[PDB]
Design a protein around this motif. Structure first.
Motif: not given
Ligand SMILES: Cn1ncc(NC(=O)c2nc(-c3c(F)cccc3F)sc2N)c1N1CCC[C@H](N)CC1
Length: 273
Positions: A230, A233-234, A237, A247, A251-252, A254-255, A257
């Motif tokens: 997770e 990926h963040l 991104w 993002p 969006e960060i 709401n990620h 992780w």
């Protein structure tokens, strides 16, 4: 006369930009920080609501220093013949993120989640107040070791938030996005998200991902520590080469992780006390 209102302490940190000392407000023994910046070294000037020639750093601090404890607040300021003097908040006990990482190594993800979440709230607070920090990094983040709360410091490289292109940058290069390296052009929010991804990698890996420009341009992220899928990926991104591929702040947060963040007090009880 500030030389009487405050008692100057030792030197907290210094650079070519200026010098900040520890201090105590004589009246109520409030712990403060006293920052000096010479007028000669001031490149960014701004206007006060009353129409006064003042460093841009003062303008930015004024606009964010109301109510929210996510950024260090400007308590007062003075103009001297050759310099300005800023009286800043100072938590006690305190330690900056860089010394914390250096001392403890790469942070556990639970702790990194709480810290990163708090800086996202602080940066989001700045943007809401029309202020771009432009030098987000561990050295500019302060940890209140008792309350577990993080605070932003050093707006000397900031600017007013705008939606058009920035053609100047005076922050830390290894934290600057690939569009600044290549085109000397960037947009505030997407540039901030980039530095945010560097910050996160630094939190969970104990070191910054890139050192040279060619590494920033390439944008390939190798992990030197065990980091969850997770989180990787963040980070990747946030570190998208294309700014429009990065993002948003919503969006960060709401990620996946970023879920079930600890409260600051919970964070300190588990990891700081
Ligand atoms: C460039 N610049 N402009 C303002 C500040 N620092 C503050 O404002 C500030 N620092 C505080 C502090 C601390 F940083 C370390 C230990 C204890 C403290 F209480 S308390 C407070 N209000 C800075 N520092 C320069 C000093 C070193 C920083 N790591 C880098 C940026």
């Amino acid at each position: 006369p500030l030389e009487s209102q405050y008692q100057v302490g030792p030197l907290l940190g210094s650079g070519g930009f200026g010098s900040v000392y520890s201090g105590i407000r004589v009246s109520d023994n409030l712990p403060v920080a006293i920052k000096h910046v010479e007028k000669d070294r001031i490149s960014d000037w701004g206007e006060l609501p009353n129409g006064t020639r003042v460093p841009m750093e003062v303008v930015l601090l004024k606009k964010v220093s109301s109510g929210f404890s996510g950024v260090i607040r400007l308590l007062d300021w003075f103009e001297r013949p050759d310099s300005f003097v800023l009286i800043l908040e100072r938590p006690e006990p305190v330690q900056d993120l860089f010394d914390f990482i250096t001392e403890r190594g790469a942070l556990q993800e639970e702790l990194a989640r709480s810290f990163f979440w708090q800086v996202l709230e602080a940066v989001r607070h700045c943007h809401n107040c029309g202020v771009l920090h432009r030098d987000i990094k561990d050295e500019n983040i302060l940890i209140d070791l008792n309350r577990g709360e993080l605070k932003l410091i050093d707006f000397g490289s900031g600017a007013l938030l705008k939606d058009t292109v920035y053609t100047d940058f005076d922050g830390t290069r290894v934290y600057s996005p690939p569009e600044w390296i290549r085109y000397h052009r960037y947009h505030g929010r997407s540039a901030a998200v980039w530095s945010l991804g560097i910050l996160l990698y630094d939190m969970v890996c104990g070191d910054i991902p890139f050192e040279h420009d060619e590494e920033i341009i390439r944008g390939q992220v190798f992990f030197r520590q065990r980091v969850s899928s997770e989180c990787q990926h963040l980070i990747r991104w946030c570190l998208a080469l294309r700014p429009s591929d990065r993002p948003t702040f919503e969006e960060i947060q709401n990620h996946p992780w970023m879920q079930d963040v600890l409260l600051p007090q919970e964070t300190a009880e588990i990891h700081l006390h």
